[PDB]
Structure formats: structure tokens, C-alpha cells
Amino acid sequence: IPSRILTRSQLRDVVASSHLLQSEFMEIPMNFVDPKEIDIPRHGTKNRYKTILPNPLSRVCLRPKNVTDSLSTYINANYIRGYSGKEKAFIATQGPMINTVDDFWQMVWQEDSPVIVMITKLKEKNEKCVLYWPEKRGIYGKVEVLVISVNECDNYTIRNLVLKQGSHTQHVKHYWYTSWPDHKTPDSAQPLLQLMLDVEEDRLASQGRGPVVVHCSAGIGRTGCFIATSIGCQQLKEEGVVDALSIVCQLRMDRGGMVQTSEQYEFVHHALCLYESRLSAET
Ligand SMILES: [Cl-]
């Protein structure tokens, strides 16, 4: 409905057009939820930022057994639609807090997520996220996580996890991208593209499985960047064009505030541009 479809040429020009991207970004409403829309007493206790809340229509509802309260189903996390409106392509969530780590893993388990993408240091001046995974093994509520391997890459490290409950096992790839500046976007999109492409290969290898879980700290800025880029590169690949405006608007339909700043919005364009240079000539 808010639309601005860009051809590959158009996309390549708009990178050197920050002025226009700022006002284009500024024309997209944040879609932050009214606190009164959420009717879950004490949901605040499970939120890292008190005004960054999950839109209720798309919130990830934990499925614990033998509790009667709505708070027991609450996690600050939303399902995010993918390319073509693909339901549950992603979950955008906040950095787990000390009191929400078991909740987090309940979500990863119950949704059958194959990949976690973590785009935050634990501390960046402030505490941004808690250490929620073990060195070898840890038990998080009903979910046991085992570290099978660690893989070091240029721009991120991977833990290869399995989650276990009883007889059941689920593999989870956990990516940790730590080099994103406190308040600036990275100077190069290559590292984030590399991550996007590795994760894209994991999704193709994970047919029928659940959403890729993406988070940073509030789970909208960097997380929105990663997801907007993932989908927009997918539109670039399939259609030869990209509607980054539309993408960000739909993302905000899923979770208020996705792609938080205009600098992030521009950075998504840098990434989409970088992706485009690797595509086969247009036709
Ligand atoms: Cl343990």
C-alpha cells in the first residue's frame, strides 16, 4: 500500500541518494502497539524495553503445560512474514533477559526453529542481551541444549546446537554477529550479506522447519535490517526488483518499529545493492 518498487538500476542509483531515503523512511509509520492493546498483566517484567512490545496479532505464544495464566504464554517476540507473505518465515525477538532465557528456548523448541541469528554484543555500554546458551550443555526449563560444535568465521562465530526433550532432538544453528557498532550501521554490508547468505543456505537445508529466530537487543533495529535484507534479496532474486519501502511496512505490520532508524533503512539498501552486483545480468 506504501509502495516504491525499484529496478536494479533504480536501486543502484538510490544508494547515492540518502536525502530521499530519509524522507521515504520518515513517511513509514512505526506501528508501535498501544500498551492497552496487550492485555497480559505483568508482561512488562518480560520486556527489555518497556515501549518495544510485541503486536498481539503476531506475537509468539509460548505453549507451556499446566499453567492457567496468560503471562505464561508471553514472550516479546513476533512471527514475521517472509517473501510473498510466507507466514512464520522469521521470529523477531528481543535479547533474552535473565528471567526470560528459558522462555526463549521454549520458543526455539516449540517453533522448531533451525537457526538463531544474534546481532548484538552482550554489552555495548549497556547490557543488551544475556548469555543464554551454554559452553557444552545447559538445561533451560524443559529444554536441554547441547553444543555439538563451534565454527569460527571471518565475521561471526557459529555454535551448532541440539535441543532435546525426552526422545526428541532438534538441531539449531546459532550465529553470533558481534561487529555492529553501538549506534552506527556498519561501514560495509558484506559481513551482513555473508551472514544472510549462510542463513539462506540453512533455510533451504531446513525444509518444513520453523522460523529463523533473529534478535538483537530490542529485536527491531538490526533484526529488522537483517530480515528486510533477507526478504529484499529474495525479491531481487525472484523478480529482478525490490520494494524495500513495502518490505519495511509489512515488517512493521508484524512487529512495530522494525528497521528503527533511517540510517538502518539506508544500510538495508547498501546490502540489497551489494547483493544485486552478484546477480546474473538482468535479461
Ligand atoms: Cl545445566
Q: Which of the following is catalytic: 216, 225, 233, 249?
A: 216
What is the architecture, at CATH level 2, of domain 1-283? Answer: Alpha-Beta Complex (3.90)
41, amino acid identity: P
What beta strand segments (E) does the chain contain? 6-7, 59-61, 74-80, 90-93, 115-119, 123-124, 126-127, 137-140, 143-152, 157-165, 168-177, 212-215, 241-242
Alpha carbons 103 and 97: distance in angstroms, whole number: 10
Contact 210, 250 (CB under 8 A): no
Q: Are strands 74-80 and 59-61 parallel, antiparallel or unpaired?
A: antiparallel
The C-alpha cell that represents 61 in the structure block: 505464544
SS3 state at 99: helix
Contact 58, 259 (CB under 8 A): no
53, amino acid identity: L
Residue located via cell numbers 542463513: 199
* Residue 163 alpha carbon to ligand 1 centre in Å: 13
State the DSSP code for 162.
E
Contact 82, 211 (CB under 8 A): no
* Residue 126 alpha carbon to ligand 1 centre in Å: 27
CB 103: neighbour CB atoms within 10 A?
24
State the DSSP code for 114.
-
The C-alpha cell that represents 189 in the structure block: 554490508
* Residue 102 alpha carbon to ligand 1 centre in Å: 12
Helix axes 221-239, 190-204, angle to 10 degrees: 70
Query: Does the annotation mark 273 as catalytic?
Result: no
Q: How was this structure determined?
A: X-ray
Name the residue ranges covered by the structural domains of the chain.
1-283
